[PDB]
Design a binder for this molecule. Structure first.
Ligand SMILES: CC(=O)N[C@@H]1[C@@H](O)[C@H](O[C@@H]2O[C@H](CO)[C@H](O)[C@H](O[C@]3(C(=O)O)C[C@H](O)[C@@H](NC(C)=O)[C@H]([C@H](O)[C@H](O)CO)O3)[C@H]2O)[C@@H](CO)O[C@H]1O
Ligand SMILES: CC(=O)N[C@@H]1[C@@H](O)[C@H](O[C@@H]2O[C@H](CO)[C@H](O)[C@H](O[C@]3(C(=O)O)C[C@H](O)[C@@H](NC(C)=O)[C@H]([C@H](O)[C@H](O)CO)O3)[C@H]2O)[C@@H](CO)O[C@H]1O
Ligand SMILES: CC(=O)N[C@H]1[C@H]([C@H](O)[C@H](O)CO)O[C@@](O[C@@H]2[C@@H](O)[C@H](O)O[C@H](CO)[C@@H]2O)(C(=O)O)C[C@@H]1O
Ligand SMILES: *[C@@H]1O[C@H](CO)[C@@H](O[C@@H]2O[C@H](CO)[C@@H](O)[C@H](O)[C@H]2NC(C)=O)[C@H](O)[C@H]1NC(C)=O
Ligand SMILES: *[C@@H]1O[C@H](CO)[C@@H](O[C@@H]2O[C@H](CO)[C@@H](O)[C@H](O)[C@H]2NC(C)=O)[C@H](O)[C@H]1NC(C)=O
Ligand SMILES: *[C@@H]1O[C@H](CO)[C@@H](O)[C@H](O)[C@H]1NC(C)=O
Ligand SMILES: *[C@@H]1O[C@H](CO)[C@@H](O)[C@H](O)[C@H]1NC(C)=O
Ligand SMILES: *[C@@H]1O[C@H](CO)[C@@H](O)[C@H](O)[C@H]1NC(C)=O
Ligand SMILES: *[C@@H]1O[C@H](CO)[C@@H](O)[C@H](O)[C@H]1NC(C)=O
Ligand SMILES: [Ca+2]
Ligand SMILES: [Ca+2]
Lengths: 318, 172, 172, 320, 172, 316
């Protein structure tokens, strides 16, 4: 008689790499690198806050684009291509620092500055870029300081915010840099202005410079923003004779949350923990080749089209 | 390969065989008949299932973004960021290639091993009643019915039952 | 396992054996005895000493502080450092897991193979003077006293001295 | 009735679970740990010329804060810094603060070198504050001089002080700019003239302007002294053009050799020896990994996000 | 070693053998000869080649400088690069040591296997006409001219031809 | 009495020691090294458009110092810099020096562009310093002009100029601010009257004030000139008001910046260089230096690592 031992095989045998062989034929295999992408953001089980056209920095200032996003709590913030947080042109000092500090947080909560001004001073200054309810306006959590009487030099005033809370607050302010002398002198004064902010853990001198520069949004002049973090049970003082644009309210950033930068759409019937510009990555696999630029709980980025893991013995055909 | 049982002394595998990885094909008076083995085919897959459970997963570590998508950050730190992001990727790339290579190598040889282990389990049962063909077959020197052939496959066969008979069939 | 010796054709280990990792049990006319193989025990111990000398150490790389414990770090560089450090200890966790997973699999299989090797050594000593039990024992077909059993362990057993005696008893 | 001989492997009743490539629950004879979870709550300082600063901040060793008097000079191979230590007695900051402490914590000593700076009869060099009390009465930073006009109101005389490095190694000069609280204060000390402090060497150059402005009291002072620093290469000289507002250096520092720099709350122990430290203390393990802290210094085992990794030190355990 | 062949039951290799890695040394009435096994020798050398293909290579990744050779850089980001570089090195140094140690283990054991797999091919061919020596030889129990030896090497040996003659000689 | 056939394996008298997972003194028949220890003291320059800058510091090229006259423009794929290279003829430094210097070394080429500026008889733009030697006589930076009053002490006119960018891509403009050694040297050049410098664009605005004060002499001049730089995007006017670049510059694509002291080789091809030459090894690791540029073997803290290419060596 005769009894034979033997093993299964297949026709369409699948090729895998080993320590010794670059083309080993095996029965079954499995991909370990995710190559297929998703171009939709998946926010099920997530208290997200889609900003859209609102840039993170505008939320502290209170631009007409960010009316809805002045307050709130979340675990995710999202930012778009070309998000505008500036009516009146110019950048903000140490921009990227502040920007990601906001996108790191999980909410903005406001407190009132409590800043009263003299009878002579008008708080409700405006501009033509910043429009709310159809017509002209200014930033919602700032107030533009300017004297009522056109010509008279603006008086040296001292204002002080006090941090009563057990947590820290983010006091933003601004400085106007006119390009002309004619509307500069009658709004503020014919003098050279001084603006000296001062805290326990911050201090600075500012000079409103005048320079020839191409107009932006019908304005030749520019305004720039400065900020610091006033401490628990600490005060900040602002000394100025015009130029300063003090804040009506100061921000507190709350808890933790992701920061996603993408142009992709939003779906709430889908859940995920890995994101990028393109969209979401919803896969059990350990590796991916979509992007090295990702956020959350991601598969590692690998410079490989495919990697096949053998799930069965050598295929021996005939 | 390492154990020389698959692409080994066994010329080829069996395309006809499904519902099993390793098993048997006996030839006797009653005629040709196939059959599969459970203990071997399960030990193989359970070992592979163990591998899929470990390799098919990711870290729970939460990474923030160090780069602005819509702004160019300071040129010197973006160069530091680029240099580490490139360096890390070369590591994860090397680690992936080496993981799957060595696991593929071990998967292949583990299977070969379970095929060898069975062939040896059958051999030691048959004791002095059978002889090795060389192609992974045992010639039996005593009449073996489907009851006798099943007693081989089920690890219940008794060698002393047909010993005196077989020895004199081998000696001739 | 891979070599089929341990958790294989040897069905279980001996909690009684305290003088080595591998050894012999015998039954003859004088009665019973147990003993360890020193050589094949050290073979396995010395390879584990090897793994431990090579795995139990740290790099002599001196590292300095890049994060302050008692003062606020710049937000930009601190986000970079946090991302770097996160990405590095992801690598090292993954390497540590993979390292021991691979070494564990090897230590086990290594130790299996050192059992199989001792079995095949004595198998070859005995030649035609014995037959494989199938449970990792050799039924000897010649009177083997305590000096005879000693000669098997010491690897001095001259098979030809009991060959005639043993082949008569094998066949009848 | 045959003589039988059997081969077998040892075993144990109470065997250990380890992880393999193929099995998450594999019982083996024996196993060891590869991750450390245990930390001495002490700083192990045997065979180390160490220096504990206490509540002296390293930066304060250079300016000369009253707390850092027993730390003005010395040699070491290890330098320990404690939480809420003191650099600035009079309120103020340092530009490149984190860069200057990191530079000090890398050092194995500080020498002090006399600048020999001289000032006119009009200038009061012994300016003092209550924010830096020393030996009962009011004082100021040991290694700097507060230059104020001696005639309250009088404009500070134009002066030019320059330090030359006569040494073979670079020196770390640093100075302060005082920023007064009000225009009344500024004028009292330096007068009404526009203030400009100019500093220049072969390798450094910068101008500073005092900042008059109201602001909260710290150590009961609205005024501020922010600190600047720079290296002065061997042979090269650094020169101070100033007309009031300069906190002049009386001495400059040389950093010497290398040292390990620990920030920790854990107390010294000269009996114990280690080469890995962290906030929590020492880590004296022989193991390759650790899950105490990802912030360590010296020759350390690698932090892993793992409670335990057991490494088989014997065969599969198949028990009776 | 794992497979017990090399530095195992075979006492030593052969400086004599220059035409291949594995081979035979025969001895009959008509003298002695020596031939190297091509198929197994090529198997080992193929497998080692496949290693050197994957091991001897570098990533195609462009690394710009991030630290100036001929000038100073910010001390705190100088410290960050030094720290990241020392870390990235510590990974690569370790990954390198492990790869080579792992591969060297595989290479030794793979070579031990190809030897054993040849020794098994031969045991099966010779079937009942030969008995195992212990030292990696087979005492053939019939007259074996060079053609009969060459038939064992080229795997063209029919046992039945010499079977009757060998069983006689063996049983004595 | 019976015939023998014997199985066996090859062996050599001179085996190599390698390290396995278990053994450190494991002797095998053959092993090849995996870490390159030996370098070559030369820069491989085959199929590479190399541009050694010798005495020229890359910042100097844009600024126009006489040593950089040959390297004023060109297109390449590789840039080489040298020890003690001259960047500034007249003493000073560059705000974000290393960041700018990076972009020059990242960039594969530089193309100068005429700014098209004209002036009056009040300001003498063409101010020549004796520090910068050119052709026996005195001279100034090729692409810059100096801001000084025709008659020393006179009040420096407040002239303002602007430059349009009509090109497809970005344009890199640099301008020189001077810090006098004293009030006596300041009065001559710019006048006693205190004065500011400022710039404007769609993205970039910044004030600059000259720092006047005594300091040690550098290259025969105690006075110090510092050069500021900014990008100007297409279809944007660059406007700066001061109380002077005739040509701007433009970076061309990308290329590998080396920074070595080693000499070049006519017929040498590599993709990996460092401060000590080129590493041309087929090997995966190397212990020459952790500072390397281009496709390179990963640095390892190991003299030698031996990869077995053969079985256990066991002689008689
Ligand atoms: C509530 C009230 O009226 N208090 C005043 C009290 O301020 C004043 O004492 C002086 O007050 C000034 C300005 O507020 C400073 O605070 C003075 O402090 C010192 C200091 O210790 O730092 C005194 C010191 O001798 C001064 N030293 C020098 C070299 O000038 C310094 C220094 O000028 C300033 O700190 C610069 O910022 O100031 C403090 O003594 C007294 C006396 O009129 O009357 C109280 O009623
Ligand atoms: C010892 C001595 O004083 N000898 C005088 C010599 O001073 C003087 O020549 C002038 O000396 C001053 C002093 O520092 C400068 O060094 C002048 O150098 C130059 C320069 O650096 O090239 C000359 C140049 O002519 C100046 N620029 C222009 C456009 O004219 C520049 C520049 O304005 C400033 O130096 C920038 O810091 O200065 C040097 O001419 C002569 C006077 O004839 O007589 C010697 O005997
Ligand atoms: C609070 C106030 O007066 N706001 C003005 C604003 C500012 O005074 C000005 O921007 C500061 O320089 O100016 C606004 O419009 C101005 C025009 O009226 C003027 O003819 O042109 C200017 C620019 O060339 C300037 O833009 C504005 O920008 O919104 C009007 C606003 O009420
Ligand atoms: C970091 O790397 C990225 C990707 O390689 C660079 O981004 C590219 O830069 C080129 C050349 O300037 C641009 O033209 C491309 O549009 C960019 N490509 C992508 C995919 O983003 C980036 O410039 C590098 N940053 C630094 C500072 O070197
Ligand atoms: C970063 O690392 C390098 C070397 O590891 C340090 O450079 C050394 O500095 C000293 C003096 O400053 C020189 O004598 C050595 O020769 C340097 N080594 C080399 C190879 O150049 C450098 O100091 C480190 N940077 C920081 C910020 O600590
Ligand atoms: C084997 O292949 C089949 C179909 O070809 C597939 O369903 C199965 O998932 C594979 N096994 C794996 C990936 O473990
Ligand atoms: C870095 O991470 C730590 C803890 O993981 C956290 O406390 C800190 O906020 C992070 N640093 C920054 C600057 O975000
Ligand atoms: C095995 O276990 C015992 C006690 O648990 C110990 O003495 C021995 O060293 C262990 N093996 C190791 C740690 O390698
Ligand atoms: C093997 O040995 C030979 C001669 O010693 C040598 O030429 C060869 O390079 C060695 N290694 C390899 C991988 O070829
Ligand atoms: Ca780059
Ligand atoms: Ca350092």
């Amino acid at each position: 008689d005769k009894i034979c031992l033997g093993h299964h095989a297949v026709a369409n045998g699948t090729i895998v790499k080993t320590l010794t062989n670059e083309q080993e034929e095996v029965t079954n295999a499995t991909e370990t690198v995710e190559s297929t992408s998703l171009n939709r953001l998946c926010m099920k089980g997530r208290n997200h806050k889609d900003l859209g056209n609102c840039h993170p920095i505008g939320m502290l200032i209170g631009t007409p684009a960010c009316d809805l996003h002045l307050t709130g709590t979340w675990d995710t913030l999202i930012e778009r291509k070309n998000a505008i947080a500036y009516c009146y042109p110019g950048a903000t000092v140490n921009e990227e620092a502040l920007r990601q500090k906001i996108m790191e947080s999980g909410g903005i909560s406001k407190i009132n500055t409590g800043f009263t001004y003299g009878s002579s001073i008008n708080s409700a200054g405006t501009t033509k870029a910043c429009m709310r309810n159809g017509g002209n306006s200014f930033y919602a959590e700032l107030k533009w300081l300017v004297s009522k009487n056109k010509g008279q030099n603006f008086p040296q005033t001292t204002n002080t915010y006090r941090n009563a809370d057990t947590a820290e607050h983010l006091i933003m302010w601004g400085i106007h840099h006119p390009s002309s002398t004619q509307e500069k002198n009658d709004l503020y004064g014919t003098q050279s202005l001084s603006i000296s902010v001062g805290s326990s853990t911050y201090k600075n001198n500012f000079v409103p410079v005048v320079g020839a520069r191409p107009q932006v949004n019908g304005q030749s002049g520019r305004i720039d923003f400065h900020w610091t973090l006033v401490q628990p049970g600490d005060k900040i003082t602002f000394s100025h004779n015009g130029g300063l644009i003090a804040p009506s309210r100061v921000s507190k950033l709350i808890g933790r949350g992701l920061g996603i930068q993408s142009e992709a759409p939003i779906d709430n019937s889908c859940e995920s923990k890995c994101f990028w510009r393109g969209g979401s990555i919803n896969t059990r696999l350990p590796f991916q080749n979509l992007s090295p630029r990702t956020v959350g709980q991601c598969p590692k980025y690998v410079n490989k089209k495919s990697l096949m893991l053998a799930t069965g013995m050598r295929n021996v055909p005939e | 390969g390492l154990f020389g049982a698959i692409a080994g002394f066994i010329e080829n595998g069996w395309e006809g065989m499904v519902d099993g990885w390793y098993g048997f094909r006996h030839q006797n008076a009653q005629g040709t008949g196939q059959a599969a083995d459970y203990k071997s085919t399960q030990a193989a897959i359970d070992q592979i299932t163990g591998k899929l459970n470990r390799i098919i997963k990711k870290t729970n570590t939460e990474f923030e973004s160090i780069e602005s998508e819509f702004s160019e950050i300071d040129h010197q730190i973006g160069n530091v960021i680029n240099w580490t992001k490139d360096s890390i990727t070369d590591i994860w790339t090397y680690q992936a290639e080496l993981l799957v290579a060595m696991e593929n190598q071990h998967t292949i040889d583990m299977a070969d091993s379970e095929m060898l282990n069975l062939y040896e389990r059958v051999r030691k049962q048959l004791r002095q009643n059978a002889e090795e063909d060389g192609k992974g077959c045992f010639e039996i020197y005593h009449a073996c019915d489907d009851s006798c052939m099943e007693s081989i496959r089920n690890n219940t066969y008794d060698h002393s039952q047909y010993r005196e008979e077989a020895l004199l069939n081998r000696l001739n």
